[PDB]
Design a protein around this nucleic acid. Structure first.
Ligand SMILES: [Mg+2]
Ligand SMILES: [Zn+2]
Ligand SMILES: [Zn+2]
Lengths: 48, 185, 145, 146, 56, 38, 96, 137, 96, 123
RNA sequence: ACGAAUCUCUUUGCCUUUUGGCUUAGAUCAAGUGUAGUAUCUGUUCUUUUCA
RNA sequence: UUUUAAGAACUAGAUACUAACACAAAUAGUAAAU
């Protein structure tokens, strides 16, 4: 369970730079809109 | 290889009386209905023009131990079911000989391999109330007899023959272990 | 690829399926065959038949002897036939050199830093420190004698 | 055919390179056997020197047998007569248990012997030519009741 | 009401009570037992036939 | 239940079984050719 | 080996007391049909045999049982968590 | 405990499943084979007991105590001929063991049958056995 | 058929060969439903064919025009590194 | 009966045949013998191998390689004709992977014929 | 007189429910609180025979 | 032929184990931290 704790501080970051990390000049990735949203993700970034 | 090598074991009767026959060969066909393992299956139609196609339902390992035709499943030599032939053969002598076979699954599969053969093989309304009803006699036999000299409800619990007929014309013609009464209201 | 997938959807997977020695499941194997190959010899120094209990228990002497060898415990069993004890010492020397030899080889794989796994590092520090202490106590004793 | 005689594990064998038969060791008693019939043939005079790791036959009908006690034991093949024994000087820093013999073979000439040993080494044995009878003879043939 | 046979696990699962597990004919041999078998059957039918009534 | 084994599995137990027919990779033909010595 | 011999003797003399005691208190046929052989025997002496066996099983069984009682009640020295500590630990006492 | 046929039935099924689990994992552990045979006799069903022994031999035949108890299991039910054929298979399987020859003797002495013990010692001598065979003959 | 014959009835192939669970999965039903680099590789491959053959299907219907056709299927063969995801299964294909 | 009883074991099989005479002679077995046994074996193996290649599913492993019924007396003659599959459908409709246990059944015995004071000190 | 069988005890023998694997001892070794459920640790006072 | 539980009532809490229950609100069995 302790291992789990470490992650929570960590994610914030990958959102605070979302819009580079996810972006549409990406080399390769299979495009998927999220479920009921209007966001497209290029390839799997699980955290984000 | 060897699967082929013990060849088919087949009746010379049920096989059908034509001069020339063709039969297929399929190297892994069905499993046995018995030992539940594969073998080579052999079709054929009896006669050429037939609608119906004989198949072979069993091993040649399994049809040997019991000694029977793979199509028929009668004895090879006597054309008779196992549960008969080894029953007669039980009788003379006195008591022996039945073949205890294989519940479960790999009991029968296992038991297939060992070569011991098996006992059989070893060797080879007007209501009419008519009473007195005999214990062993069926209705088929009754109305059998009636139609044979010229329609029924029997109760074998109470040994009371209940009976009805279409027209009393069959009243005369009926009459013209039996309790008679011509009974109706 | 698919040809298999569908023969397995009809004919079921295979029951035996041996398997192979490999990177991960190595030691267990090495061990396992070692033990077996003591039990031959020790079964043939005994006069006749008496086996099962005598056997198992003698193997327990094996392990105990090894983990003595590591800890550098001199290991004298109070009373027990000389030849048997010979056998155990013979093997445990053999396993010993398997161990030390692997400790060198791996250390000199890490110093280059060429694809040594994670735990392999931590382990190999274990095998080292052990060896280093043995050298130590040796060096002292001979400084006595 | 089975040949059941030996008493515990049968640990080694070899084929006579001519005679068409096979020496089968055992633990402590080293028999031969004929093929075709699976006869018995002979029984080599061997007290318990075993554990026999190996046999090697030869072109001259020498027989070799390696012990784990560290003793080489040569025989005649025909007979059973054991005509030489040798403690194999184990090694420099070894452990008395590490004297043993884990394999053997003869080169194709029949005159040179090669064996491995649990002390991490190979040894090669040579057939000494002086011999004849001069003062050759070995243990001198007093066949006993097996 | 009859008692359950506890299901199956692996499709080939064996019910040991039903049939002789793996049946070893003791042997043939020279001395022709064959009559002893009748005293056997008589004793086994005898035993089981008892327990049904008296209840062990 | 961690136990030192006392045994090994007879190959025979396997041998009775019926086959499967899965196709491995390492069985695909390679080196179809023998070589003889003079 | 020697034990099997000795036991053979013991049951010899015991058998002798059976027969003689039975005096104090008072063929081979073949089938040309099948190679089975047929010997003819009394229902007597089979029962004495079986009974003797049963009683041996009894008396030995009871020697071992009383030995359970006595042996497990007596020794009270070494530590014991359970039965098997007493058992095994008495094996370690058997050692020296 | 037991009431009628049906309860006895369940009491058997349960035992057999259990044991033959434990024999399924250890082919060895002879004691287990023995005890399971013994239970099988206490159920007054021999046929199964015969088998269970036989299997127990197919695993190991050099283990005499099983031979012996698969004799006494035949004798204590007062069935002899089985306990004869078994003896031919015994000494023929292991002639070098005395205990089998002696036991087969005693089986023939308590039956008083001499013709046997004559021809019997004729064999057990014909193999040039050792001092004790002649001495006892 | 292959799916429904493994008794996975809660996976759906839409018409474009995406594979979607319809019902949040019990973990067991995940493990039972991981599918192979085969089945996935092949689904992707079909996807590619469907894509191209579609664009033609359109043009025949008269909804496009022969230039936009040619450009289309060009676009497809170049942007496969996006439109599908075959590079998950053979990663080798990252040469093409 | 003396033969019936112990029938199998017999003393001539304990007794070594080169004790009497050394030099008893045992021939290694000729030439046009080993070129027979070699023949009937080699053929038998080629039948094995050629089966197991022509079983399986490399359609291209097969590249690496009769009326046959008189039934009864043949009475009705016969011809035995394989039926070409439907190459899509499985071949070996009955094949499967199951598990069997076999009776190890034999007729004959193998007399095992071999040859506690000071030793239990040692061991 | 001695021999034998039976019961009982003792000693020896037999081992009877009589330690079943491997890796870095396989690694790590105390930092809480509220309520609640269960386990179970003390004392006090009175009293020691039977039939329809 | 078996067989003796010292009997009954009162009372309190003290050491324990535990519980995805409760202190801008969120963690789990490949990896853990100056
Ligand atoms: Mg884990
Ligand atoms: Zn069958
Ligand atoms: Zn027919």
């Amino acid at each position: 369970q302790r291992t789990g704790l470490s992650q929570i501080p960590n994610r914030r970051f990958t959102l605070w730079w979302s819009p580079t990390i996810n972006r549409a000049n990406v080399y390769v990735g299979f495009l998927v809109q999220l479920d009921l949203t209007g966001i497209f993700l290029h390839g799997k970034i699980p955290t984000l | 290889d060897e699967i082929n090598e013990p060849p088919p074991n087949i009746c010379e009767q049920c096989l059908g009386d034509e001069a020339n026959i063709r039969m297929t060969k399929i190297p892994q066909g069905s499993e046995c209905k018995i030992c539940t393992l594969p073998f080579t299956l052999y079709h054929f139609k009896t006669s050429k023009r037939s609608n119906n196609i004989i198949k072979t339902l069993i091993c040649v390992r399994c049809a040997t131990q019991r000694n029977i035709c793979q199509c028929c499943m009668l004895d090879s030599r006597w054309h008779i079911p196992i549960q008969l032939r080894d029953h007669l053969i039980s009788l003379v002598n006195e008591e022996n000989v039945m073949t205890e076979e294989a519940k479960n699954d790999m009991m029968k599969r296992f038991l297939s391999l060992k070569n011991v053969k098996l006992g059989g093989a070893q060797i080879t309304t007007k209501s009419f109330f008519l009473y007195n009803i005999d214990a062993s006699i069926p209705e088929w036999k009754i109305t059998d007899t009636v139609s044979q000299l010229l329609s029924l409800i029997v109760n074998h619990k109470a040994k009371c023959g209940g009976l009805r007929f279409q027209s009393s014309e069959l009243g005369e013609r009926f009459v013209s272990i039996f309790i008679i009464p011509w009974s109706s209201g | 690829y698919i040809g298999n997938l569908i023969t397995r959807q009809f004919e079921g997977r295979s029951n035996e399926i041996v398997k192979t020695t490999t990177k991960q499941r190595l030691d267990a194997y090495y061990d396992l065959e070692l033990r077996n190959s003591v039990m031959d010899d020790i079964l043939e120094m005994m006069p006749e038949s008496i086996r099962q209990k005598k056997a198992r228990t003698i193997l327990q002497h094996l392990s105990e002897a090894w983990r003595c060898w590591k800890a550098n415990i001199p290991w004298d069993v109070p009373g027990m036939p000389a030849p048997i004890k010979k056998i155990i010492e013979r093997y445990i020397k053999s396993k010993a050199d398997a161990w030390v030899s692997a400790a060198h080889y791996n250390r000199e794989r890490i110093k280059r830093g060429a694809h040594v796994e994670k735990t392999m590092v931590k382990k190999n520090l274990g095998r080292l420190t052990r060896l280093w202490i043995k050298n130590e106590q040796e060096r002292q004793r001979q400084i006595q004698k | 055919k089975v040949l059941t005689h030996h008493k515990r594990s049968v640990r080694a064998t070899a084929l006579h390179p001519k005679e068409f038969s096979v020496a089968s060791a055992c633990t402590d008693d080293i028999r031969s056997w004929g093929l075709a019939e699976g006869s018995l043939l002979t029984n080599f005079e061997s007290e318990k020197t075993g554990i026999i790791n190996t046999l090697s036959i030869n072109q001259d009908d020498v027989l070799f047998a390696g012990g784990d006690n560290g003793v080489l034991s040569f025989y005649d093949y025909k007979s059973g007569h054991k005509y030489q024994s040798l403690a194999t000087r184990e090694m420099v820093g070894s452990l008395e248990g590490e004297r043993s013999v884990l394999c053997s073979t003869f080169d194709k000439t029949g005159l040179r012997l090669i064996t491995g040993e649990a002390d991490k080494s190979i040894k090669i044995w040579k057939q000494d030519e002086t011999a004849t009878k001069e003062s050759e003879p070995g243990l001198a043939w007093n066949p006993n009741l097996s | 009401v009859a008692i359950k046979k506890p299901k199956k696990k692996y499709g080939t699962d064996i019910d040991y009570n039903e049939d002789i597990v793996y049946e070893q004919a003791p042997m043939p041999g020279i001395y022709d037992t064959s009559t002893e078998d009748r005293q056997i059957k008589k004793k086994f039918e005898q035993f089981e036939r008892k327990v049904n009534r008296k209840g062990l | 239940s961690h136990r030192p084994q006392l045994e090994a599995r007879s190959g025979a137990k396997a041998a009775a079984y019926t086959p499967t027919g899965i196709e491995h990779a390492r069985l695909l033909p390679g080196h179809t050719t023998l070589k003889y010595r003079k | 080996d020697q034990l099997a011999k000795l036991s053979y003797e013991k049951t010899l003399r015991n058998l002798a007391t059976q027969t003689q005691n039975s005096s104090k208190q008072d063929k081979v046929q073949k089938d040309t049909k099948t190679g089975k052989i047929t010997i003819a025997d009394d229902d007597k002496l089979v029962n004495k045999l079986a009974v003797s066996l049963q009683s041996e099983s009894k008396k030995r069984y009871e020697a071992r049982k009383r030995q359970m009682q006595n042996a497990k009640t007596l020794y009270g020295v070494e530590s014991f968590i359970n039965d098997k500590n007493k058992q095994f630990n008495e094996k370690l006492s058997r050692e020296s | 405990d037991i009431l009628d046929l049906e309860e006895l039935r369940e009491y058997q099924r349960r035992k057999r499943t259990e044991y033959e689990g434990y024999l399924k994992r250890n082919r060895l552990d002879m004691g287990q084979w023995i005890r399971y045979a013994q239970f099988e006799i206490e159920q007054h069903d021999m046929r199964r007991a015969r088998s269970i022994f036989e299997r127990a031999l197919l695993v190991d035949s050099s283990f005499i105590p099983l031979w012996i108890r698969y004799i006494d299991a035949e004798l204590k039910v007062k069935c002899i001929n089985h306990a004869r054929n078994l003896m031919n298979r015994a000494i023929s399987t292991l002639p070098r063991v005395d205990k089998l020859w002696y036991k087969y003797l005693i089986v023939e002495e308590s039956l008083n049958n001499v013709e046997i013990v004559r021809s019997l010692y004729t064999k057990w001598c014909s193999l040039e056995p050792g001092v004790n065979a002649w001495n006892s003959f | 058929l292959l799916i429904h014959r493994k008794g996975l009835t809660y996976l759906h192939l839409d018409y474009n060969f995406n594979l979607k669970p319809t019902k949040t999965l019990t973990t067991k039903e995940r493990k039972k439903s991981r599918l192979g680099n085969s089945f996935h590789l092949m689904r992707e491959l079909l996807k590619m064919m469907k894509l191209i053959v579609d664009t033609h299907v359109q043009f025949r219907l008269g909804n496009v025009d022969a230039f936009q056709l040619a450009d289309g299927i060009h676009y497809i063969l170049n942007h496969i590194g996006q439109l599908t995801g075959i590079y998950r299964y053979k990663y080798k294909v990252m040469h093409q | 009966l003396t033969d019936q009883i112990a029938k199998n074991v017999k003393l001539d099989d304990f007794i070594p045949k080169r004790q009497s005479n050394f030099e008893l002679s045992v021939p290694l077995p000729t030439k046009a013998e080993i070129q027979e046994c070699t023949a009937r074996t080699k053929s038998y193996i080629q039948r094995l191998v050629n089966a197991k290649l022509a079983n399986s599913n490399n359609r291209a492993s097969s590249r690496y390689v009769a009326p046959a019924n008189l039934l009864l007396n043949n009475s009705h003659h016969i011809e035995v004709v394989s039926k070409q599959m439907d190459p899509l459908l499985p071949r070996f409709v009955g094949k499967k992977a199951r598990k069997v246990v076999a009776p190890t059944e034999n007729d004959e015995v193998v007399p095992v014929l071999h040859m506690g004071e000071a030793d239990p000190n040692e061991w």
